[PDB]
Design a protein around this ligand. Structure first.
Ligand code: K
Ligand code: K
Ligand code: K
Ligand code: MG
Ligand code: MG
Ligand code: MG
Ligand code: MG
Ligand code: MG
Ligand code: MG
Ligand code: MG
Length: 188
RNA sequence: GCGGUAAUUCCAGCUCCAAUAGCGUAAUUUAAGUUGUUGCAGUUAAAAAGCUCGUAGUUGGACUUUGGGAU
């Protein structure tokens, strides 16, 4: 089969050139690499986007089906390290696709699951962005000027894997939810 | 509170004071945060049932869409 099977855009939309490039990269990863050949046969991405994080640096965010989030997680590290070498120093982020439902209008009898609330989806996205790190604390500081800055504490165990991705995580989260977040490692 | 033999307080004279064609005397408001919703009290001044349960009544933790771009 072709690489088009690795990309499934919503409503069968036509992907851009970056989606095609990422799908091709995944296809060659499945084919050439034997260790990941078994895992990647039934894995496809919903969409792929590019976000700039700093001068002369950029990051690529890949959205994957919700039902395959566990499968992607169990192979996250190898896949990210293999894909990074192909984009010339661009970090790769996997975020499961989720739907946000607006609150029911006042007086309506419609009920919305709490998982579909904006806050729950934002928390899930924040949990997914720092993979493989695990969040161990959260602080929100309300500045005098009226701005909010959130501090997220990550487990030091994944320091070697996450330390260099902090700025990319901040930029990606800001783009995805418009929230200012900083990452720090507890001292101990 | 005055008056019991030196009475600014009674009975009078004089003088003086308040209001003034008005003034005195015999339900109700304010003052009253002395009925307190605003806004009172309950150790010793009046005051929390000997103790617990308990239906009416009153009261009841947190959580679900924020932000920027612009205009
Ligand atoms: K006498
Ligand atoms: K006398
Ligand atoms: K008198
Ligand atoms: Mg006399
Ligand atoms: Mg006289
Ligand atoms: Mg009293
Ligand atoms: Mg007594
Ligand atoms: Mg008493
Ligand atoms: Mg008693
Ligand atoms: Mg009784």
């Amino acid at each position: 089969y072709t690489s088009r099977q690795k990309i499934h855009k919503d409503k069968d939309a036509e992907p851009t050139e970056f989606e095609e490039s990422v799908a091709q990269a995944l296809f060659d990863m499945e084919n050439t690499n034997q260790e990941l050949k078994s895992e990647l046969k039934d894995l496809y991405i919903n969409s792929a986007v590019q976000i700039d994080v700093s001068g002369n640096k950029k990051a690529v965010v890949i959205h994957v089906p919700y039902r395959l989030r566990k499968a992607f997680r169990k192979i996250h590290v190898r896949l990210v390290r293999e894909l990074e070498k192909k984009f010339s120093g661009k970090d790769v982020i996997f975020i499961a696709t989720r739907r946000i439902a607006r609150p029911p209008k006042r007086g309506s009898a419609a009920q919305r699951p709490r998982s579909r609330t904006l806050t729950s989806v934002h928390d899930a996205i924040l949990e997914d962005v720092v993979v493989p790190a695990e969040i161990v604390g959260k602080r929100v500081r309300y500045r005098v000027d009226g701005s909010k800055i959130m501090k997220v504490f990550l487990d030091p165990k994944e320091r070697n894997n996450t330390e260099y991705k902090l700025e990319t995580f901040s930029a990606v989260y800001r783009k995805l939810s418009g929230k200012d977040v900083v990452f720090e490692y507890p001292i101990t």
